[PDB]
């Protein structure tokens, strides 16, 4: 039943559909856009082999997008943590909503995609903001 966009065995990204967050996953089978990818999380073996929507998996995260070069709209990848917005959490896609710059201050605003979108959140991690990989 193999297929042969993400071939085997590649290194990818995968999205935990419960949570919404991005993680590092590799390809271990590709069944049959309409595909259905089989895959292995990197830091988590006791998740098994998990079966993907091609929609779920993309490549990996490689290029961040400088506070300069961020702009009111765009679709990224970054750190939130929708519990408690102060602390460190986990890799959501997000469309910059405000952008804002004070002598001492940066201040970024994001709709997080938690599927069901976060409006307005503040985002702590201004220097660590991902380019989403398109095909």
Same mark, same amino acid.
């Given at each position: ?18 949570? =919404? ?26 998740? =098994? ?23 009111? =709209? ?62």
């Amino acid at each position: 039943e193999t297929e042969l966009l993400y071939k085997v065995n590649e290194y990818v990204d995968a999205r935990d559909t419960n949570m =919404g967050a991005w993680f590092e996953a590799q390809v271990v089978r590709v069944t049959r856009e309409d595909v259905i990818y089989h895959v292995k999380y990197d830091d988590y073996p006791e998740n =098994g082999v998990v079966q993907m929507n091609s929609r779920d998996v993309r490549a990996r995260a490689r290029t961040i997008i400088k506070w300069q070069d961020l702009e009111v =709209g765009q679709v990224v990848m970054l750190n939130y943590n929708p519990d408690n917005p102060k602390e460190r959490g986990f890799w959501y896609d997000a469309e910059i909503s405000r952008k804002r710059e004070t002598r001492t201050a940066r201040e970024l605003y994001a709709n997080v995609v938690l599927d069901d979108s976060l409006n307005d959140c503040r985002i702590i991690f201004v220097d660590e903001v991902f380019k989403i990989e398109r095909p």
